[PDB]
């Protein structure tokens, strides 16, 4: 997998060497094709995972993501052509390159055989992200948000560093292939009960768990649209990908060491879903929607039943695409409105007829409408959770009712009701804004036709 | 300085560490340490400002008593073994003295009070020498005697330094002292692995030298001893803003940059030796060091602090360039990580 | 560590014994990296000194890309040796002190009985 | 090119990684042994030069 | 030692006088010249860990 990567690196030379006026089209047009080369990995006509080479591999779980990581770079670069079009021609070429490095790094992290290669690349992604959030962040508080995003991930990260070096000594190689075909069975000691927490905690932090998710609402609030898309679509899912490949070892402990997180997540799912119900900042509501719909995932990567896992793989890819779509349209309202407040800007369909159709489809993806991969995902996690304990439906049942309420409230108070009297007149929709959306949903429609590709390792 | 004097002094400041390293007769190692003490004091008071005399008089007393303690260890050994050099048989107290003494000259842990203060009153230039070409000498003496020193003490001085360095740095706003504090911290990691794998001490030093030498020549390019002063870097010289950003995050352990390797292999070696208690606590507060590094990042790069009108005047005039060493030592430092296996 | 080994060359860079090892291919990814590492140093310099970034010092750019690379071949040539000594040393010991590193028989899974924790 | 290439490539990747793993662990055992044993080329700490003694006729009987 | 510029250069400015059995002026052997010899020709080729 060096075509999904080397051609990517070369994007950096192109963003720099290219003309200031033509820099945007060379980069966006080329990474669209970079995504097309990424599609070749999907050709698995057999079960055997595709070990491209010693360090680089792609199995069913990584492949559905590498393609998404390559896909969003085009979109990210199309959603940030407006803001970042007021810059000095060298601030742009830095932002474009920053976005380019994220997927170079993220493509490799999702396509990495050695778990510590994951760690080095895993924690590197913070550098590009922190720059995108802090340097171009509009609000006074991004310095703070950046600190929260760096420390919560970093304090979790050093325990994983110690744990992975620890298993290398215990087993003798951090190669995901071998670690899988070798006998690593923890022994339920008090210490192992700590190892397990060391490995999972760093992944559980960037996958916002109810206890440590305050970093994500603060980060996406002041982050520029491209950073918020990356955090929701690819960055948070780095934590999920890690939990799937790391729990191959630590096989016995999670049977009983998971209860704490599972309950934290399911109760967390309800409270995070509910506070979405009365949050005035739209970007705030989407972020907590992201916490709740990701709290379902940590509760399926821990129950560990075949269906959970691919419920997880289905939902992660699906929610990634949906969340961005929501964060992308939130930005389009923010740029004309100039405020994140949900109460202002009422009635837009009256003035932006189509964006409202995109808003409606994004919300229906947000809630579980049935001919969507989003529902298949939740339906499956719901099933397994029920298997874990029939009572789980109650808590995963209060979340579904709340999820319907906030998803439609975003449509009802942003895209319906009487028009706002006279905010700065809202200029019509650009074709870029609409495509950036179409590019998010057309793939959501196509993937829903053949869900098999994003089903995970389990199935 | 009459250029002749400059030569004699500089030769001594350079013959000082070199005799230490080359000789085996400890005595000759002691006088190597003694010269370094004599040569550095003249340069320290070059401005001869009231702050400077204070600096040198502290540096000298701290250095002198430690030098006398190191000599006492050699004198005692001479009577416990006729040899003029530490051996397997050496009384444990004899070696511990040498650790404390040498940990004072290097300024590690509970003897970390002199360094921040002398780093504050000396010029940026002599600051570098006082931080990096004066640590080579004592460390050489320790690295030579590693097989014999105590694992317990070193670790305590190691951990303490890491903490003191980190905590001290958080509050400081003067750059010279932020660096002094960082050096205490890095010096700590170095002395942690000495008992186990000296060869890694020599890596955690070089990398510190290849990181600090560019960082200081950066601080002086604009001769800013204040963060507020380095924050207006964007107006005085915009290009160094990019690398100053990476070098400081490299000084802390963040993974893509070269700075991770020293911490990573030291942790790998300590876990190989089973100190998974000690290594863990060190790595954790090591994370405190990055917080103050990033706070500076914020002021200098990620956010643009307001500047005075006269800054436009300094822009007009051609900026005297930074030596080439900056580049070669900025890149070899910010990004060599892809080449770690051969470094270790 | 590896110092104190018999025959150690007290101050030499790479003892001739390292002749026996294969020479590093000049295009070894690493040496090529050092090259790029170098080009960047050059470009960076131009930038910090405020010169046209790429179109200036085309002589220097060469000195850099060619100094770093030169250094590489002769360094890697050594680091390669050091690692090679490590095996000579390591493998030898495994034998000279055989009992301590005994070959082990691993029972076919048929025989071994790892317990099965059910997920249910 | 086929199912054959990845299956055979993955087995080659596993053999390199399995052999690297066994050696890395044996290093740690050899390095534990030579440190304490001191019977191997690594961890051979120095003692003074024999070349500097003086077995020459001294000025007093009984050296 | 750390940098053996002495063995390399072949010079011996610091080794000739490190132990009591080294050449004493006018060949006046010191006390113990007998032992130290016996204790360093023993520990020669045997590293410290096994000179102890």
């Amino acid at each position: 997998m060096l075509k999904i990567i080397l051609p990517s690196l070369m994007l950096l030379p192109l963003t720099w060497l290219s003309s200031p006026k033509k820099t945007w089209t060379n980069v966006t047009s080329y990474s669209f094709l970079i995504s097309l080369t990424s599609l070749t990995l999907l050709w698995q006509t057999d079960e055997n995972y595709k070990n491209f080479s010693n360090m680089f591999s792609s199995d069913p779980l990584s492949t559905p993501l590498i393609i998404l990581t390559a896909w969003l770079l085009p979109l990210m670069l199309m959603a940030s052509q407006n803001h970042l079009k007021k810059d000095n021609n060298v601030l742009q070429k830095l932002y474009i390159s920053m976005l380019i490095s994220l997927q170079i790094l993220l493509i490799m992290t999702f396509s990495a055989t050695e778990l510590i290669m994951f760690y080095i690349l895993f924690e590197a992604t913070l550098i590009p992200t922190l720059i995108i959030i802090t340097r171009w962040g509009n609000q006074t508080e991004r310095l703070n948000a950046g600190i929260y995003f760096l420390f919560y991930t970093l304090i979790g990260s050093i325990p994983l560093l110690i744990a992975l070096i620890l298993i290398q000594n215990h087993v003798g190689t951090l190669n995901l292939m071998i670690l899988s075909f070798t006998t690593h069975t923890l022994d339920a000691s008090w210490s192992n009960n700590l190892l397990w927490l060391a490995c999972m905690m760093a992944f559980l932090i960037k996958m916002p768990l109810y206890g440590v998710h305050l970093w994500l609402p603060k980060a996406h609030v002041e982050a520029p649209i491209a950073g918020s898309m990356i955090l929701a679509a690819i960055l948070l899912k780095l934590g999920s990908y890690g939990m799937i490949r790391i729990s191959i070892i630590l096989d016995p402990l999670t049977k009983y060491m998971a209860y704490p997180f599972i309950l934290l997540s399911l109760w967390g799912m309800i409270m995070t879903s509910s506070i979405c119900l009365r949050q005035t900042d739209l970007k705030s509501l989407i972020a907590y929607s992201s916490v709740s719909h990701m709290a379902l995932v940590i509760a399926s990567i821990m129950i560990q039943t075949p269906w959970s896992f691919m419920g997880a793989t289905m939902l992660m890819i699906a929610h990634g695409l949906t969340s961005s779509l929501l964060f992308c349209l939130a930005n389009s309202n923010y740029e004309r409105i100039h405020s994140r407040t949900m109460i202002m800007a009422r009635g837009l369909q009256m003035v932006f007829p189509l964006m409202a159709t995109w808003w409606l489809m994004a919300s229906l993806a947000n809630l579980a409408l049935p001919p969507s991969i989003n529902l298949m995902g939740e339906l499956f996690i719901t099933m397994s959770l029920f298997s874990w304990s029939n009572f789980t439906i109650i808590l995963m049942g209060i979340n579904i009712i709340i999820t319907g309420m906030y998803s439609m409230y975003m449509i009802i108070t942003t895209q319906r009701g009487k028009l706002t009297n006279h905010m700065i007149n809202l200029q019509p929709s650009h074709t870029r804004e609409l495509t950036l959306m179409a590019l998010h949903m057309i793939p959501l429609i196509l993937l829903t036709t053949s869900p098999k590709l994003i089903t995970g390792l389990t199935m | 300085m009459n250029p002749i004097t400059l030569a004699i002094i500089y030769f001594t400041i350079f013959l000082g560490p070199v005799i230490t390293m080359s000789s085996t007769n400890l005595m000759l190692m002691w006088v190597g340490l003694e010269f370094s003490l004599l040569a550095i004091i003249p340069m320290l008071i070059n401005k001869k400002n009231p702050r400077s005399t204070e600096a040198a008089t502290k540096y000298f007393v701290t250095q002198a008593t430690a030098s006398m303690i190191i000599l006492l260890a050699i004198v005692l050994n001479y009577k416990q073994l006729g040899t003029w050099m530490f051996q397997q048989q050496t009384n444990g107290l004899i070696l511990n003295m040498t650790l404390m003494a040498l940990s004072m000259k290097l300024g590690l842990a509970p003897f970390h009070f002199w360094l921040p203060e002398v780093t504050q009153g000396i010029p940026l230039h002599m600051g570098l020498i006082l931080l990096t070409w004066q640590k080579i000498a004592p460390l050489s003496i320790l690295i030579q005697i590693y097989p014999l020193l105590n694992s317990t003490i070193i670790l305590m001085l190691a951990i303490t330094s890491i903490f003191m360095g980190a905590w001290g740095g958080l509050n400081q706003t003067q750059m010279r002292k932020i660096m002094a504090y960082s050096s205490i911290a890095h010096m700590g990691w170095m002395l942690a692995i000495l008992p186990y794998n000296p060869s890694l001490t020599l890596l955690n030093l070089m990398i510190y030298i290849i990181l600090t030498a560019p960082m200081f020549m950066a601080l002086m390019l604009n001769n800013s001893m204040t963060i507020n002063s380095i924050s207006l870097l964007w107006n005085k010289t915009p290009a160094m803003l990019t690398m100053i950003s990476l070098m400081l995050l490299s000084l802390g352990g963040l993974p893509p940059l070269t700075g991770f390797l020293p911490k990573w292999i030291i942790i790998t070696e300590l876990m190989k030796n089973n100190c998974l208690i000690m290594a863990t606590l060190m790595a954790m507060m090591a994370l405190l060091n990055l917080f103050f590094y990033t706070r500076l990042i914020y002021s200098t790069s990620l956010t643009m602090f307001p500047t005075n009108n006269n800054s436009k005047m300094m822009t007009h005039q051609t900026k005297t360039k930074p030596n080439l060493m900056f580049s070669t030592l900025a890149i070899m430092s910010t990004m060599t990580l892809p080449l770690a296996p051969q470094l270790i | 560590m590896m110092n104190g080994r018999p025959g150690h060359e007290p101050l030499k860079f790479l003892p001739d014994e390292a002749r026996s090892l294969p020479p590093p291919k000049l295009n070894d990814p690493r040496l090529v990296y050092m090259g790029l590492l170098g080009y960047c140093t050059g470009l960076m310099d131009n930038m910090l000194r405020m010169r046209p970034v790429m179109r200036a010092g085309l002589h220097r750019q060469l000195l850099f890309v060619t100094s770093f690379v030169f250094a590489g071949y002769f360094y890697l040539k050594r680091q390669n040796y050091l690692y090679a000594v490590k095996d000579h040393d390591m493998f030898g010991y495994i034998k000279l002190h055989p009992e301590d590193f005994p070959e082990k028989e691993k029972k076919t899974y048929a025989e071994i009985l790892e317990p099965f924790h059910p997920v249910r | 090119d086929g199912p054959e290439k990845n299956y055979e490539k993955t087995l080659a990747i596993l053999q390199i990684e399995s052999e690297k793993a066994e050696l890395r662990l044996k290093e740690q055992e050899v390095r534990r042994l030579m440190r304490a044993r001191g019977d191997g080329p690594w961890y051979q700490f120095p003692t003074p030069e024999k070349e500097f003694i003086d077995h020459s006729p001294k000025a007093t009987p009984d050296n | 030692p750390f940098l053996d510029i002495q063995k390399k250069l072949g010079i011996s400015l610091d080794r000739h006088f490190m132990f009591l059995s080294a050449e004493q002026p006018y060949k006046n052997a010191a006390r113990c010249h007998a032992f130290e010899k016996e204790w360093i020709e023993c520990a020669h080729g045997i590293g410290g860990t096994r000179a102890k």
């Binding site: - | 270790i344 | 090892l21 390669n80 000279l96 | 191997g40 | 020709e41 045997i46």
Partner: peptide
């Protein structure tokens, strides 16, 4: 009687086995 010298590992160098066995550096 004096103790024997540590034994001498013997042979000729051969390129290291599988290369630097560092972290995923296939070297």
């Amino acid at each position: 009687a004096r103790p024997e010298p540590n034994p001498v590992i013997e042979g000729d160098l051969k390129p290291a086995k599988h290369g630097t066995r560092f972290f995923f550096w296939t070297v």
